């Protein structure tokens, strides 16, 4: 876990680092004056590297505190607050995604060749799903509730979307039957689906080092 925490947090901080520049920063003389506890991205990045976070909750609390200071120092209605709010949301979203499936999260960030084809445990349910404007594309189910399913599509972008349950078909349905445009992109996604299914059958699990 401690090794995993390190690499996962590094992925998140790296992503949080850029949308954090735009930049005139919380180093006014009044920063001392309005802000209780000090923190910035470099401090967080150091704490990640030195293994200072005991849990993801402690990391999240530092991200929250950074948001709180920005709000206090610039005002809740300020544009700096808007940006910092989006930063915090994005950070917490990554933590959500990590919790959803650690293996998906690692592969999605590290992106080795054919990253989306490696199996997870438990295996993700596979479906055909259509979005408004599109025909059916193959996808992995990440989670679901009664009236909708959270999927990540095969192919370009590997688009993440909520799909109404009525727009889902079992992966065992015959492709030729239902509606979709057989574009090059769609065929590429179907190839990726098949390669994923082959890796599953092979027991070809992702191996680091």
Residue 62 vs 97, nearer CB to Zn ion: 97
Cis peptide before 105 (omega within 30 of 0): no
Q: What share of the chain is helix, strand, coil (3-state, %, to 5)?
A: 50, 15, 35
The residue count for binding Zn ion (CB under 5 A) is 4
CB of 124 to Zn ion, least distance (A): 6
Residues 6+ apart with CB under 8 A from 173: 128
- To the question of whether residue 92 is assigned a binding role by annotation, the answer is no
What is the C-alpha separation between 28 and 26, in angstroms, rounded? 6
Residue 110 vs 178, nearer CB to Zn ion: 110
Residues 96-135 binding Zn ion (CB under 5 A) are 101, 103-104, 120
Residue 29 vs 122, nearer CB to Zn ion: 122
- To the question of whether residue 190 is assigned a binding role by annotation, the answer is no
CB of 126 to Zn ion, least distance (A): 12
Is 67 within 8 Å of 84 (Cβ atoms)? yes
Residue 59 vs 106, nearer CB to Zn ion: 106
Tokens standing for residue 189:
């996604």
What is the C-alpha separation between 126 and 130, in angstroms, rounded? 13
| Phi-psi domain of 154 (left: phi exceeds 0; alpha: psi -120 through 50; beta: other) | beta
CB of 18 to Zn ion, least distance (A): 26
Residues 130-189 binding Zn ion (CB under 5 A) are none
CB of 105 to Zn ion, least distance (A): 8
**Dihedral over Cα of 64, 70, 76, 81: its sign:** negative
CB of 1 to Zn ion, least distance (A): 18
- To the question of whether residue 93 is assigned a binding role by annotation, the answer is no
Annotated binding site for Zn(2+): 101, 104, 120, 124
Binding site listing: 101, 104, 120, 124
Residues that bind Zn ion (CB under 5 A): 101, 103-104, 120
């Amino acid at each position: 876990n401690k090794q995993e925490m390190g690499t996962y947090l590094r992925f998140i901080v790296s992503r949080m680092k850029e949308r954090a520049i735009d930049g005139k920063d919380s180093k006014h003389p009044m920063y001392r004056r309005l802000v209780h506890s000090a923190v910035d991205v470099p401090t967080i990045q150091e704490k990640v590297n030195e293994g200072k976070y005991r849990s993801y909750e402690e990391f999240k609390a530092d991200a929250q505190l950074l948001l709180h200071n920005t709000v206090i120092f610039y005002g809740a209605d300020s544009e700096q607050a808007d940006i910092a709010r989006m930063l915090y949301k994005d950070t917490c979203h990554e933590l959500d995604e990590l919790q959803l499936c650690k293996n998906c999260f690692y592969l999605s960030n590290a992106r080795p060749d054919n990253w989306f084809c490696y199996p997870c445990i438990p295996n993700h349910e596979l479906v055909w799903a259509k979005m408004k404007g599109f025909g059916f594309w193959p996808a992995k189910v990440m989670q679901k509730e009664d009236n909708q399913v959270d999927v990540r599509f095969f192919g370009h972008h590997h688009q993440r979307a909520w799909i109404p349950s009525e727009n889902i078909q079992d992966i065992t349905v015959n492709v030729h039957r239902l509606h979709v445009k057989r574009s090059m992109g769609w065929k590429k996604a179907c190839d990726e689906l098949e390669l994923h299914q082959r890796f599953l059958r092979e027991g070809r699990f992702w191996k680091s080092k």
